[PDB]
A paper describes a structure:
BgaA is specific for galactose β-1,4-linked to glucose or GlcNAc [lactose or N-acetyllactosamine (LacNAc) motifs, respectively] found in glycoconjugates. The N-terminal region of BgaA comprising amino acid residues 138–993 has amino acid sequence identity with GH family 2 enzymes. Through detailed structural and functional analyses the molecular basis for the catalytic specificity of BgaA is defined and this activity is demonstrated as critical for the ability of pneumococci to utilize complex N-linked glycans as a carbon source and protect the bacterium from opsonophagocytic killing. Further analyses also revealed the presence of non-catalytic CBMs within the C-terminal region of BgaA that mediate adherence to host cell surface LacNAc and/or lactose.
The X-ray crystal structures of a catalytically active fragment of BgaA was determined to 2.7 Å resolution (data not shown) and an inactive Glu645Gln nucleophile mutant in complex with unhydrolyzed LacNAc to 2.2 Å resolution. This polypeptide had five distinct domains, four with immunoglobulin (Ig)-like folds that are arranged to create a nest in which the central (α/β)8-barrel domain III sits. The positions of the nucleophile and catalytic acid, Glu645 and Glu564, respectively, in BgaA are conserved with the analogous residues Glu537 and Glu461 of LacZ. Notably, however, there was no evidence of bound metals in the active site of BgaA. Indeed, the side chain of Arg288 occupies the space where a Mg2+ atom is bound in LacZ while Tyr713 and Glu716 fill the region occupied by a Na+ atom. Consistent with this, the activity of our catalytic region construct displayed no sensitivity to the presence or absence of metal ions (data not shown).
Residue numbers in the entry: 138 to 984
Amino acid sequence: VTNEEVNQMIEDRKVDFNQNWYFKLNANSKEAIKPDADVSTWKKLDLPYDWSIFNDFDHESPAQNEGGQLNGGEAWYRKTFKLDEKDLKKNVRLTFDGVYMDSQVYVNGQLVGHYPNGYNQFSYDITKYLQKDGRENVIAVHAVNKQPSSRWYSGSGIYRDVTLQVTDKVHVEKNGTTILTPKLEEQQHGKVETHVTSKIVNTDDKDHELVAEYQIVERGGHAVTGLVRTASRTLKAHESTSLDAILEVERPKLWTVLNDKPALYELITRVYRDGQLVDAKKDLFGYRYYHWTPNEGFSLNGERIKFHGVSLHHDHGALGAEENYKAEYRRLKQMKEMGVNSIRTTHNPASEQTLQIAAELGLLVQEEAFDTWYGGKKPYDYGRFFEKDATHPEARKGEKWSDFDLRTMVERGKNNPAIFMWSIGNEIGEANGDAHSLATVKRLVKVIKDVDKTRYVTMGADKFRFGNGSGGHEKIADELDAVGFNYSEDNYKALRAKHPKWLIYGSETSSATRTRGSYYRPERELKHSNGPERNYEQSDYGNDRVGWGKTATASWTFDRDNAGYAGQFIWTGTDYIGEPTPWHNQNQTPVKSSYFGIVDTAGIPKHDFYLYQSQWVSVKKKPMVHLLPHWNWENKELASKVADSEGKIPVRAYSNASSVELFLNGKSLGLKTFNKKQTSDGRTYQEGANANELYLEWKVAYQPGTLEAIARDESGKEIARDKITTAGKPAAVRLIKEDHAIAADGKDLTYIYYEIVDSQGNVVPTANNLVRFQLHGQGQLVGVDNGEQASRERYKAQADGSWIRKAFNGKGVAIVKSTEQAGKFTLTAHSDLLKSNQVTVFTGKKE
């Protein structure tokens, strides 16, 4: 057997099962299951598919605007498939990355399983339900989203990938590989012992003789070991065993967040039955170590870092709940451009895409199992299943759904270098230190530790922000490895004095609210300002925050000033559908999406993105300067809110540079210098006129034209510019390509921005013009967005098949997915009385 053949076997082991499904909302259960159903009345599609995202907004929706005002319901999905002749005796497993929710899977008329969880991955061995002789089988999936189930937009149905594993009767079982590097800090400059465990099952009714062979390789690289073999032993029929080996890898490269292409490795497993290669598998992993102390916080590979982190919902804007590798890559790559090193998957398990991209980009991950325990937060959420018996075929005796779901998530991610924290709850009210909650936290911690001891078990708790933060809930925190504070910076000092051994971080911070390109009262701090005068908008100066919240500056400066507060996960990294605080559940208002994000649903940064970048990215890696606001102040209503007593517009610069000099129409308004300072522990930092300003400010009398900012190093040498220009009346639509080409695989996509521009090419920053889109060629329009919270516009096509969307504050995005045919597609944009534009994107070979 050649290495070529082994790799093919690995590749053939797992396939994409997303293709050729039929969908019908409210379909008849008996017809969906039955062998030769009439599917003329069904919709033929490829997964993932979120059915909720094609709905219109409904002011009367049971989801309410916390759930995006997009309705759920019930639906069936249907696939028919035949095993190849070679595969007839093989074991067949079906994996669903996420189905929301309350699902039932039927194979040839029989119920394989019921699975409540809407975010956790699950698989079924469906071998026994398959027809003999290679006759076609029918798989039918029932998904139910009965509202309200969610405190944010969930979507409905099969929003994540479905995959099929076809294997020998003797095979490495699902989630069966464990890779550990116990002595890595010690052995790192020499040979590092890599302990691998394999969990092999014999589904045959004959006994077979078993050997495992292991090799490690650099991902997209060379081998770093030879073949290492376990001793031959008998595996009895219908039994499973665990195999072990140690492999030595010399001076491996350590996975870190300190570069954007961190080192990854792959374990190759070969399984022999009676001396014949019958199974082959690869498992992604990395070499990293970390430590965390109460007063010094966190270090990765001996380097002290803070969690510069974001909370993220799953949700892709116009894509709705449909997960996509390219969409998630763009979101995460962009987070990383800001200086983010850490994401929290709030509040639910992550997709395979998110976990993989995080390993690929160098982002530390906290994956969260639960938004509630046994109490519940919404009637149709998970709370009702939490203590009920798992009915999964492969559930262990006495396992509750919470037990089974937590276990399986940890087994799925135990080898992923990115994950360093497992969260067993967010804002669990019932976790107050009573006997029941105390029992429950211990049970849950123990589930994890029976699988994985290497990662921090944690929770995100807002109980610490009430009063002095102390209470029976402190007893629950005692059971955790690390204790997450939600919005509790005010009680940290006291809580820290009380619990000197606690490892503390901000599990949820800020909740500042902003609308891109919208400005209000920069001079004030606005607390939960949801009045009619706000016009359903919040300020991009970043001076709006909810009642329990903090601004970016307040929340970041605190984190920065305290070593024992290890970092934070800001709410939120990007906008999501739903939860439109400060207009939460005011359902007759137009708001349907969040204000919390640093970036809007359209992927377009708000100004605070640049504030964070100035703080988190070194001037060596990326010198920058960013100006706000815009320079169009002709409109008196707009200006009356921004301009001060003398009618000057406060202009502000974010920079990681030493100084910024602002020019109006070529004339200097003065050079200003950041004040340099040190943390009590000697970390160096920069700030402005005072401790509450991380920016430089100029009060500028409004003269139309150009503002330009020159950023300089200490030598007085220019390292960065930014520039803002007054726009004229809209003259045209401009389309901006992110990608010159994408892959022709039917999965890759591109984001093209549309701007409303004047005759000189300046973006009109106030423009809300409606744009109509045409697509020709080898592509599929799959979304449109402008990020605006108060918009009730379709994200998808209109009822007549049209694609339209307004600009909001000059900008928006359109999303095009590739087909499986190489060639090109062209996007033309039109707006009324404006010039049109087109860009062409090529589709073809990959990478």
